Amino acid sequence: LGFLGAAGSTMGAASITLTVQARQIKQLQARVLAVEHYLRDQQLLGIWGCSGKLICCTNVPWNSSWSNKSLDEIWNNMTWLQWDKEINNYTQLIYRLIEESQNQQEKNEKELLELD
Amino acid sequence: LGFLGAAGSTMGAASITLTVQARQIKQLQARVLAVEHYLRDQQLLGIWGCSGKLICCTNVPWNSSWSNKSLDEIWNNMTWLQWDKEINNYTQLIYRLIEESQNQQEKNEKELLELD
Amino acid sequence: LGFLGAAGSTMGAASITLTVQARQIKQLQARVLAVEHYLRDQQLLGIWGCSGKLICCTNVPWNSSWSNKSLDEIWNNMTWLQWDKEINNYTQLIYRLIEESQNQQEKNEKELLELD
Amino acid sequence: SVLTQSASVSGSLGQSVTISCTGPNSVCCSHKSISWYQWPPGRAPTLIIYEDNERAPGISPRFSGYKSYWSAYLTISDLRPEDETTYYCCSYTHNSGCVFGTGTKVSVLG
Amino acid sequence: GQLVQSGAELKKPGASVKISCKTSGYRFNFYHINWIRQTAGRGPEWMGWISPYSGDKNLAPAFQDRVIMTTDTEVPVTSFTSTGAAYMEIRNLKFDDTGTYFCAKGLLRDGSSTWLPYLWGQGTLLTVSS
Ligand SMILES: *[C@@H]1O[C@H](CO)[C@@H](O[C@@H]2O[C@H](CO)[C@@H](O[C@@H]3O[C@H](CO[C@H]4O[C@H](CO[C@H]5O[C@H](CO)[C@@H](O)[C@H](O)[C@@H]5O)[C@@H](O)[C@H](O[C@H]5O[C@H](CO)[C@@H](O)[C@H](O)[C@@H]5O)[C@@H]4O)[C@@H](O)[C@H](O[C@H]4O[C@H](CO)[C@@H](O)[C@H](O)[C@@H]4O[C@H]4O[C@H](CO)[C@@H](O)[C@H](O)[C@@H]4O)[C@@H]3O)[C@H](O)[C@H]2NC(C)=O)[C@H](O)[C@H]1NC(C)=O
Ligand SMILES: *[C@@H]1O[C@H](CO)[C@@H](O[C@@H]2O[C@H](CO)[C@@H](O[C@@H]3O[C@H](CO[C@H]4O[C@H](CO[C@H]5O[C@H](CO)[C@@H](O)[C@H](O)[C@@H]5O)[C@@H](O)[C@H](O[C@H]5O[C@H](CO)[C@@H](O)[C@H](O)[C@@H]5O)[C@@H]4O)[C@@H](O)[C@H](O[C@H]4O[C@H](CO)[C@@H](O)[C@H](O)[C@@H]4O)[C@@H]3O)[C@H](O)[C@H]2NC(C)=O)[C@H](O)[C@H]1NC(C)=O
Ligand SMILES: *[C@@H]1O[C@H](CO)[C@@H](O[C@@H]2O[C@H](CO)[C@@H](O[C@@H]3O[C@H](CO[C@H]4O[C@H](CO)[C@@H](O)[C@H](O)[C@@H]4O)[C@@H](O)[C@H](O[C@H]4O[C@H](CO)[C@@H](O)[C@H](O)[C@@H]4O)[C@@H]3O)[C@H](O)[C@H]2NC(C)=O)[C@H](O)[C@H]1NC(C)=O
Ligand SMILES: *[C@@H]1O[C@H](CO[C@@H]2O[C@@H](C)[C@@H](O)[C@@H](O)[C@@H]2O)[C@@H](O[C@@H]2O[C@H](CO)[C@@H](O)[C@H](O)[C@H]2NC(C)=O)[C@H](O)[C@H]1NC(C)=O
Numbered sequence: 100l101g102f103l104g105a106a107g108s109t110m111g112a113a114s115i116t117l118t119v120q121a122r123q124i125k126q127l128q129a130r131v132l133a134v135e136h137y138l139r140d141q142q143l144l145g146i147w148g149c150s151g152k153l154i155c156c157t158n159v160p161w162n163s164s165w166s167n168k169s170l171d172e173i174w175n176n177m178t179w180l181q182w183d184k185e186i187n188n189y190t191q192l193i194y195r196l197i198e199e200s201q202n203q204q205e206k207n208e209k210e211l212l213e214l215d
Numbered sequence: 216l217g218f219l220g221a222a223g224s225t226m227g228a229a230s231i232t233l234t235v236q237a238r239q240i241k242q243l244q245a246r247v248l249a250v251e252h253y254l255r256d257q258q259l260l261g262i263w264g265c266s267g268k269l270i271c272c273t274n275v276p277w278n279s280s281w282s283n284k285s286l287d288e289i290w291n292n293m294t295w296l297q298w299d300k301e302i303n304n305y306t307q308l309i310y311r312l313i314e315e316s317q318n319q320q321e322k323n324e325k326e327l328l329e330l331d
Numbered sequence: 332l333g334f335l336g337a338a339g340s341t342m343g344a345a346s347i348t349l350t351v352q353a354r355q356i357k358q359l360q361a362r363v364l365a366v367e368h369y370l371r372d373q374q375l376l377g378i379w380g381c382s383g384k385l386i387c388c389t390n391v392p393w394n395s396s397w398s399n400k401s402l403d404e405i406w407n408n409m410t411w412l413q414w415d416k417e418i419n420n421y422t423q424l425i426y427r428l429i430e431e432s433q434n435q436q437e438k439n440e441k442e443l444l445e446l447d
Numbered sequence: 448s449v450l451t452q453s454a455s456v457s458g459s460l461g462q463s464v465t466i467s468c469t470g471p472n473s474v475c476c477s478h479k480s481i482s483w484y485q486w487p488p489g490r491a492p493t494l495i496i497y498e499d500n501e502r503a504p505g506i507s508p509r510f511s512g513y514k515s516y517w518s519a520y521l522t523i524s525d526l527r528p529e530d531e532t533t534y535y536c537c538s539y540t541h542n543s544g545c546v547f548g549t550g551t552k553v554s555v556l557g
Numbered sequence: 558g559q560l561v562q563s564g565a566e567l568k569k570p571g572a573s574v575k576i577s578c579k580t581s582g583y584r585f586n587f588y589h590i591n592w593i594r595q596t597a598g599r600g601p602e603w604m605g606w607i608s609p610y611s612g613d614k615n616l617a618p619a620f621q622d623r624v625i626m627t628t629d630t631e632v633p634v635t636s637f638t639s640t641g642a643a644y645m646e647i648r649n650l651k652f653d654d655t656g657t658y659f660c661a662k663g664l665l666r667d668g669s670s671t672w673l674p675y676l677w678g679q680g681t682l683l684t685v686s687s
């Protein structure tokens with residue numbers, strides 16, 4: 100299929116290809132920048148508790164104001180490019196909520212570690 | 216509380232705030248250096264099997280030679296700054312023991328799985 | 332032993348030392364290169380679901396065309412240096428198969444949780 | 448030798464043949480492994496089986512070991528004229544040398 | 558992987574004999590070198606083995622007072638193969654010591670079966686006469 104060949108496919112179809120895109124003085128600056136972008140996303144996954152996973156479920160409920168579409172209307176009727184545009188203004192809210200949910204989980208894990 | 220706000224608090228109190236502190240041409244050198252420090256710490260956690268966790272229990276027994284203090288003398292009576300000075304000469308030894316324990320653990324997990 | 336001290340040892344014997352090698356203007360270029368080198372392999376482990384592990388079992392079956400050698404012939408009769416040469420032409424093929432298997436596993440675990 | 452083997456075994460072409468190896472429990476087979484060799488007279492031998500289960504490289508699937516405390520066994524499936532030779536069993540440990548048995552002859556009929 | 562032995566030799570009783578075992582196609586130091594005797598009146602007998610790496614040797618009780626083993630320093634050919642030779646000396650030969658002598662090498666670099674005589678030389682005859 101190749102890199103980003105899934106971009107025009109439905110979100111459900113695209114989900115099978117995630118590993119394809121997971122891969123990959125001006126020259127020196129470019130090399131540092133490429134590293135920063137890689138790590139930027141990895142830090143977010145670590146913050147969310149999703150590190151090491153391609154697909155990570157969270158405890159944050161879907162908020163219907165972000166989108167009123169049904170799962171079939173999202174997963175089989177849209178591309179990821181279209182989906183990002185539909186919720187482009189809410190992505191920061193979602194990221195913050197995921198972090199807050201992880202913070203509560205870590206507090207609970209701490210108690211469990213002392214108990215057993 | 217904010218970044219390093221727990222520094223004067225006891226170690227036990229500080230353990231609550233780890234979530235907060237886990238976060239956060241010359242510019243090029245600054246950017247490279249910031250990356251090296253992030254990865255240095257993550258490399259150790261990955262080797263120890265502690266990646267993705269703020270608090271990670273191990274199978275390494277405490278040597279009374281490293282410290283003769285009781286848990287109460289450590290957790291409720293010390294700052295982390297004071298504690299690091301007490302074990303500054305033993306820290307590298309402890310790190311190697313954690314690494315050996317992780318490698319023995321995974322070897323045993325492999326051998327267990329061979330039976331399935 | 333020491334860094335790469337196990338290189339001449341058998342593949343089975345060498346496994347006890349994995350942590351030894353897991354750790355560890357021109358000066359700036361050297362520093363950036365070391366980071367890129369480190370991240371290249373960590374990126375593969377993150378995709379494979381093997382992040383945080385020194386030894387990681389997968390769901391990919393061994394294809395006898397890659398090697399027809401018995402486990403004794405590999406683990407008790409080879410160095411890792413010799414082994415890498417034997418499968419040097421198949422290494423990238425194996426890597427892609429691991430990635431495909433992980434993505435299917437991530438999808439299947441998601442579907443299990445959707446049902447439950 | 449402390450180990451003993453039957454003087455001979457036989458069977459028809461394509462028939463399975465089994466060869467025993469026995470001795471004192473201290474020699475065969477409590478806490479011991481038995482290896483097997485082909486050893487034609489006047490010629491160097493070839494290793495067939497080691498650790499009572501593993502085939503040596505270059506050895507056909509027709510050869511396989513079986514084990515009991517009282518005796519180790521070698522079984523030859525699909526008997527051929529090519530296999531019409533003398534066989535020996537060897538008791539061994541990781542800390543000791545080989546103890547050879549008396550050997551056996553294999554005959555191929557028809 | 559191949560082993561080559563010294564050709565057959567005739568000796569008088571009480572004479573010493575030295576038998577070489579040249580090796581090629583594999584790393585000499587990686588595997589144990591075994592010596593095995595075959596005599597019609599005795600069947601196969603273990604003469605013990607010598608490590609080319611540590612120099613350690615294990616002679617069977619029958620041969621401890623009569624057999625001496627030594628090896629040459631290996632000379633590399635490739636990064637994974639080398640050449641070299643093992644030698645065995647037998648003191649005070651008897652008529653009972655006649656028959657074929659074999660050189661053989663260990664099966665594995667590790668595991669419980671590491672010293673088993675996987676590869677054998679053609680073997681050569683020793684003869685004793687008055
Ligand atoms: C570089 O390359 C070389 C060549 O490849 C590598 O060397 C090879 O290394 C492997 C792994 O260590 C060795 O395999 C091991 O061999 C031993 C048997 O050897 C023993 O018997 C010798 C007998 O000779 C005399 O001494 C005995 C004493 O009782 C007398 O009875 C005899 O009459 C003789 O006088 C003895 O000399 C040996 O001791 C000496 O040599 C050893 C060599 O390794 C030294 O350590 C000693 O200090 C001493 O100098 C020795 O006793 C087998 O026993 C091993 O099998 C056990 O260990 C395996 C480890 O993987 C394991 O898998 C097996 O299951 C088995 O373990 C069992 O036994 C253990 C006993 O403690 C138990 O704890 C365990 O639970 C289990 O029950 C193993 O087969 C190769 O022989 C060696 N090859 C050569 C040619 O030397 C070298 O390692 C490489 N270097 C590097 C850095 O990689
Ligand atoms: C900087 O350093 C200082 C000094 O080390 C440190 O202050 C110590 O903080 C620890 C807690 O981390 C205190 O230990 C606990 O004290 C609990 C309360 O007992 C008394 O103090 C109460 C107020 O304490 C808080 O607020 C003050 C400022 O007001 C602050 O200094 C304290 O640190 C703390 O934040 C007070 O409300 C309480 O009230 C009693 O007395 C009044 C008198 O009028 C009376 O009216 C009330 O009815 C009541 O009788 C009392 O005065 C105590 O409960 C606690 O023990 C419980 O919690 C622990 C921890 O969960 C459990 O393990 C335990 O089983 C109990 O459940 C514990 O003893 C310590 O006393 C402070 N030391 C001093 C000298 O004040 C600061 O926190 C450090 N700052 C930072 C940022 O780290
Ligand atoms: C670019 O865009 C086009 C148009 O969107 C995409 O083409 C679509 O591709 C998808 C995925 O392959 C198709 O989805 C499947 O279509 C099948 C069509 O039926 C076939 O068989 C009938 C006769 O029985 C024929 O008449 C018909 O023409 C087809 O030959 C359905 O049968 C499938 O349903 C099955 O699978 C789905 C998904 O798992 C299940 O939910 C169903 O229950 C059932 O098991 C499925 O619907 C889609 O039809 C294609 N559209 C068109 C118009 O052809 C391209 O794929 C896209 N390219 C890329 C790279 O993304
Ligand atoms: C142990 O290995 C040797 C040699 O095999 C080669 O060298 C090893 C160290 C390792 O690098 C392997 O991957 C190499 O292939 C085996 O000896 C070989 O046996 C075959 C079959 O008889 C013979 O054709 C070869 O010539 C031998 N050696 C070489 C260099 O060709 C030996 O059998 C192995 N022992 C086992 C599996 O028990």
Ligand SMILES: *[C@@H]1O[C@H](CO)[C@@H](O)[C@H](O)[C@H]1NC(C)=O
Pocket residue numbers: 162163164165192
């Ligand atoms: C859902 O999102 C809207 C818009 O940000 C917000 O006003 C509302 O409170 C959210 N609902 C919940 C339950 O968080």
Ligand SMILES: *[C@@H]1O[C@H](CO)[C@@H](O)[C@H](O)[C@H]1NC(C)=O
Pocket residue numbers: 172176177
């Ligand atoms: C699916 O989304 C597209 C693009 O917004 C839209 O045109 C189409 O009508 C939608 N289908 C349904 C059934 O809503």
Ligand SMILES: *[C@@H]1O[C@H](CO)[C@@H](O)[C@H](O)[C@H]1NC(C)=O
Pocket residue numbers: 278279280
């Ligand atoms: C404690 O440390 C001393 C000094 O390094 C060491 O000798 C001893 O073995 C250690 N104890 C344990 C249990 O590791």
Ligand SMILES: *[C@@H]1O[C@H](CO)[C@@H](O)[C@H](O)[C@H]1NC(C)=O
Pocket residue numbers: 394395396397
């Ligand atoms: C095994 O490997 C060979 C060589 O790459 C390949 O042709 C063959 O299809 C492979 N078999 C399977 C089942 O993948």
